[PDB]
Design a protein around this nucleic acid. Structure first.
Ligand SMILES: [Mg+2]
Ligand SMILES: [Mg+2]
Ligand SMILES: [Mg+2]
Ligand SMILES: [Mg+2]
Ligand SMILES: [Mg+2]
Ligand SMILES: [Mg+2]
Ligand SMILES: [Mg+2]
Ligand SMILES: [Mg+2]
Ligand SMILES: [Mg+2]
Ligand SMILES: [Mg+2]
Ligand SMILES: [Mg+2]
Ligand SMILES: [Zn+2]
Lengths: 132, 217, 83, 129, 101, 221, 71, 25
RNA sequence: GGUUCGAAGACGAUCAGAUACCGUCGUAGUUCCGACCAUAAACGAUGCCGACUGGCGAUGCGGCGGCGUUAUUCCCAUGACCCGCCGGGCAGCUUCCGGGAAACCAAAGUCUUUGGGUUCCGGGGGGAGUAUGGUUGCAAAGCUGAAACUUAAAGGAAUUGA
RNA sequence: UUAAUG
């Protein structure tokens, strides 16, 4: 089995986390890049780390990777969190109102409103799942 | 909160409650949550009383504002519905958020790196965050909990009856509680509305994110 | 806790729950001190004085904590009497 | 069937004190129970109670504090003299500082301290502390 | 010790039920204690249906089914691997195995 | 040697802004650091090893024997603890038992018998404590009697400063771990019992976390 | 006790008087069968004539020859 | 040794003792 | 009266040996009526009555209320469904009520903070449910029921190896 | 199918 160990995988994740701009698709380029940036004592471990770097870069080019903190993907995530639309979906011209909700709003202070719409009650009381 | 015309329920909050569906409760019933329900509908859905929801929100706002340090109020969400909401709530208020993967032992184990000793917990869902309730059972930690009619009140301390399943309802109740605490401490005057729009706190389906990305360009 | 002379001779006076009227032990690590803030009636902001409430761990593990908080707040005038 | 109404009512209020209720409904109203509640009232273990009087065995609603540790009962009604009352309060009360053993006397239903004051023994009712 | 709450059966308020002879052995098992498999079975399983549909006289005639309610005991069920032993937390989960295949 | 604090309460103890552990036992804060007790009560604190218990588990290559140290700790005025720690060697076992005992000291409540003049000497009321089948009851005693008890809970009450106490026993008291934990539960429930002297309403003073919340964020994270 | 009536003295006394006979020390002390089987007959010491000397083999693990006398 | 067959052997032995005693009677 | 099955018994297999497990027969029995026997792992290994302390979804019977579908058909009123309320009937699930040695138990809880009322029954393991005495039965056996002597353990729950 | 013992 050609299974990479944790000393390969965690070190490769640290290398890609610190030097995402330097690394690339080509194995013989980013192998020498990892040789320059990282102090690896042996060529076999260096080749394992470089191969797992190439595989994680293929995973990054395919999509997002869970156990990594890329600055560009973090900026994209922050942008998608800070995205604000134009008009709110809570502001509606017609709001569907059930009759018991209309009764409790009538017993509250806000009985009559401007933009509500009392609908007909759903006749036929069949809401539970059949057993077994 | 009691017989005070300033802290009453507001007509701009009524329509947003009705649009988000926070009164739209669950199908089943927990016995502790029976005092917050007005009447059960047809098709088996309890109605959460919005005025009493506003009162529990006001008391939780008291519990937040009474803590002097804003940084040590733990704001926890494990489900994906409230992960954006707790992070933006902590960014708005000044708290320390927990959004997904709550490690067991962050309140008890010293040698762990994320050993925080807060003063107040604000729980998104009881069944989803049963474990922070267990660490708040061993550490002297009061608890705020956004609870449904089905949600139990085990080890919670001040609960707000809400619809914790609807993604609009959760973010809307986070927005109401955030506006209320930022109006209670000296940031926002209550005459003018707050600038930040309630769609910021809502969690987005990635299918809807791809739909908006197609519709924008 | 006085003696025949009248001196406070105990070494600490323990806390007492405001809901069940029972004292809290030294290692009841689930106990609370809920601090409810005060609101100025003309301003609507934080004053500085508090309303504290202690609850032992038995009421929390039973499940009657927030109901007791609501009753004590309604008694002290925090929550409206209508509710 | 129901043998000791007083013992049933005091076990009911003991379970209510152990669970932590603010008030409890005990179902029969007996004169012995009402005098027991007034004896606990004059020492302040419980709140102010009331009885609901139909033209039957009435009911009693007792407002409960958290001061009552255990409300007990001694069945049957053993005779207690002034010589033996020291041994009774030795082996039934947790301390000689607090705790009370009420027992019915010729002067009336009253606790052991007032029994020492008025010099009259009698049949034991129970204990409460 | 008491291994099960309902003691390997479903008798709670009866005290006595009628016995049934087993299918593999001739063991006399109580009715609620026996493992009951209601086997539905198409009379040909996999490969013979392709030949029957060609050699049949009537066009598009459905093949019959063979309904057998097998009653096994505990020893026969575990020997023929109908039921297996479970862990002490998994014993209480009395949900049936699924019907995807 | 220099204790770097981890907990917020330990930081307050190292800053000396809480005056005693009486407020810690008031607010029921967990003492998880061991050097807090050596700071406050380290002058009169005493260690006595009760029993080394050689328990063992069976492996495929014989059995693995590891010793279970029991340590009774406490100064002679109120605060005593019972530490239980099992480890591979007896020195680390006794050291860990002392550390867990410092984490789990409790104060004892002492009262009067009859006349209330002088210092309190005995258990104020008939209290009890149990774990497993071992049941240990503590009875009030007159002055100058001595702890009328078995030698190990007599040692624990002599550490507690309860000079006079009648006792009772029930169950297999030969198991010294459950026996010491039962008398430990009794002397812990001495404060958990509701005394009628405590009928005064509790005026809640301010928690030290809420007191010094500015120093706790300006001197560290 | 189980029956806690005000006048159950003969019931409690007769039940305890019946149940004392199931104790091992009480029945051995209060029946004459053990006193008859005792060679001393309720005596602490007894004189007797030696007739032979016996070498008694020992029990399990301890293995020896004890020295006894047929008195 | 099963206690049931021990009880059965004791019943056989009691039947033998009754048969031996009835012959002497 | 005996269809089937089937103690005993016979035969054929297996095994070193089977007077056992396997197969083929096969008596008593298994079936009905009239009399005995009164023994079960006769179990919930949990006496009976009464009071109290958490919920959840059910099921069974009876009674009550309420949107609406489906039968009598031509409507009122009754059956089948749906949502609830109450009494107990067997149960189940859930958790730091509480208990217990634990497994576990809403009772096995309300027990050293020990007392609701009442029967039967145990006092280390064997000997031994044996001898003897009495009584019942046609018999098998049923009820009551020791001692001498011997032993430092026998046993229950749970953990880790094998 | 057989598979007993220390
Ligand atoms: Mg077994
Ligand atoms: Mg049966
Ligand atoms: Mg045959
Ligand atoms: Mg043969
Ligand atoms: Mg045969
Ligand atoms: Mg029998
Ligand atoms: Mg039985
Ligand atoms: Mg008892
Ligand atoms: Mg015996
Ligand atoms: Mg020996
Ligand atoms: Mg047995
Ligand atoms: Zn079978």
């Amino acid at each position: 089995g050609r299974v990479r160990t944790k000393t390969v995988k965690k070190a490769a994740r640290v290398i890609i986390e610190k030097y995402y701009t330097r690394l690339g698709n080509d194995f013989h380029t980013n192998k020498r890049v990892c040789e320059e940036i990282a102090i690896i004592p042996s060529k076999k471990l260096r080749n394992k780390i470089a191969g797992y770097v190439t595989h994680l870069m293929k995973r990054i080019q395919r999509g997002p990777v869970r156990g990594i903190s890329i600055k560009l993907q973090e900026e994209e995530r922050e942008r998608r969190d800070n995205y604000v639309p134009e008009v709110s979906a809570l502001d509606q011209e017609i709001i569907e109102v059930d009759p018991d909700t209309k009764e409790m709003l009538k017993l509250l202070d806000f009985g009559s409103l401007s933009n509500l719409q009392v609908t007909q009650p759903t006749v036929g009381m069949n809401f539970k799942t059949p057993r077994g | 909160s009691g017989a005070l015309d300033v802290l009453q329920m507001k007509e701009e909050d009524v329509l947003k409650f009705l649009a988000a569906g926070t009164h739209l409760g669950g199908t089943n019933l927990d016995f502790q949550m029976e005092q917050y329900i007005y009447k059960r509908k047809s098709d088996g859905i309890y109605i959460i009383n919005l005025k009493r929801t506003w009162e529990k929100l006001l008391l939780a706002a008291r519990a937040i504002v009474a803590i002097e340090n804003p940084a040590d109020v733990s704001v926890i969400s494990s489900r994906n519905t409230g992960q954006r909401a707790v992070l933006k709530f902590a960014a708005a208020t000044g708290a320390t958020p927990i959004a997904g993967r709550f490690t067991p032992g962050t309140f008890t184990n010293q040698i762990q790196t994320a050993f925080r000793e807060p003063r107040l917990l604000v729980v998104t869902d009881p069944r989803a965050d049963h474990q922070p309730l267990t660490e708040a059972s061993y550490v002297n930690l009061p608890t705020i909990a956004l609870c449904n009619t089905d949600s139990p009140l085990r080890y919670v301390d001040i609960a707000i009856p809400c619809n914790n399943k609807g993604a609009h309802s959760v973010g809307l109740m986070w927005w109401m509680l955030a506006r209320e605490v930022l109006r209670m401490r000296g940031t926002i005057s209550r005459e003018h509305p707050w600038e930040v729009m309630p769609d910021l706190y809502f969690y987005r389906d990635p299918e809807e994110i791809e739909k908006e990305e197609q519709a924008a360009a | 806790m006085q003696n025949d002379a009248g001196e406070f001779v105990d070494l600490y006076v323990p806390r007492k729950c405001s809901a069940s009227n029972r004292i809290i032990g030294a290692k009841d690590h689930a106990s609370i001190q809920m601090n409810v803030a005060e609101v100025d009636k003309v301003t609507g902001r934080f004053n500085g004085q508090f309303k504290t409430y202690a609850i032992c761990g038995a009421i929390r593990r039973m499940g009657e904590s927030d109901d007791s908080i609501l009753r004590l707040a309604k008694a002290d005038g925090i929550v409206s009497k209508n509710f | 069937v129901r043998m000791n109404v007083l013992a049933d009512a005091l076990k009911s209020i003991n379970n209510a004190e152990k669970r932590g209720k603010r008030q409890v409904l005990i179902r029969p109203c007996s004169k012995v129970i009402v005098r027991f509640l007034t004896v606990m009232m004059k020492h302040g273990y419980i709140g102010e109670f009331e009885i609901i009087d139909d033209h039957r065995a009435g009911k009693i609603v007792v407002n409960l504090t958290g001061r009552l540790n255990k409300c007990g009962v001694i069945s049957p009604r053993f005779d207690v003299q002034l010589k033996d009352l020291e041994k009774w309060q030795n082996n039934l009360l947790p301390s000689r500082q607090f705790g009370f053993i009420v027992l019915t006397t010729s002067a009336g239903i009253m606790d052991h301290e007032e029994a020492r004051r008025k010099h009259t023994g009698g049949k034991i009712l129970g204990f409460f502390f | 010790t008491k291994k099960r709450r309902n003691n390997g059966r479903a008798k709670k308020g009866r005290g006595h039920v009628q016995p049934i002879r087993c299918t593999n052995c001739a063991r006399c098992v109580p009715k609620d204690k026996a493992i009951k498999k209601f086997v539905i079975r198409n009379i040909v399983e996999a490969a013979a249906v392709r030949d029957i549909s060609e050699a049949s006289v009537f066009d598009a005639y459905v093949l019959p089914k063979l309904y057998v309610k097998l009653h096994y005991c505990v020893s026969c069920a575990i020997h023929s691997k109908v039921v297996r032993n479970r862990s002490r937390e998994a014993r209480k989960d009395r949900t049936p195995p699924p019907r995807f295949r | 040697k220099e204790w770097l604090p981890v907990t917020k309460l330990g930081r307050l103890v190292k800053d000396m802004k809480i005056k005693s552990l009486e407020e810690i036992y008031l607010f029921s804060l967990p003492i998880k650091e061991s050097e807090i007790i050596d700071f406050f009560l380290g002058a009169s604190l005493k260690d006595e090893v009760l029993k080394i218990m050689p328990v063992q588990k069976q492996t495929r290559a014989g059995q693995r024997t590891r010793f279970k140290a029991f340590v009774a700790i406490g100064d002679y005025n109120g605060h005593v603890g019972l530490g239980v720690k099992c480890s591979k060697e007896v020195a680390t076992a006794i050291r860990g038992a002392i550390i867990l005992a410092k984490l789990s000291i409790v104060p004892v409540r002492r009262g009067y018998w009859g006349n209330k003049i002088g210092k309190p000497h005995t258990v104020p009321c008939k209290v009890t404590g149990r774990c497993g089948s071992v049941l240990v009851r503590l009875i009030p005693a007159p002055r100058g009697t001595g702890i009328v008890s078995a030698p190990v809970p007599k040692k624990l009450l002599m550490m507690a400063g309860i000079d006079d106490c009648y006792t009772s026993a029930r169950g297999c008291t030969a198991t010294l771990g459950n026996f010491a934990k039962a008398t430990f539960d009794a002397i812990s429930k001495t404060y958990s019992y509701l005394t009628p002297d405590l009928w005064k309403e509790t005026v809640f003073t301010k928690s030290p976390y809420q007191e010094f919340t500015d120093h706790l964020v300006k001197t560290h994270t | 006790g189980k029956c806690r009536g005000l006048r159950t003295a003969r019931k409690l006394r007769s039940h305890r008087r019946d149940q004392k006979w199931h104790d091992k020390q009480y029945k051995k002390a209060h029946l004459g069968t053990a006193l008859k089987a005792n060679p001393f007959g309720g005596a602490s010491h007894a004189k007797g004539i030696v007739l032979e000397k016996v070498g008694v083999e020992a029990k399990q693990p301890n293995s020896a020859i004890r020295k006894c006398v047929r008195v | 040794m099963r206690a049931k067959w021990r009880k059965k052997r004791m019943r056989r032995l009691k039947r033998k003792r009754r048969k031996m005693r009835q012959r002497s009677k």
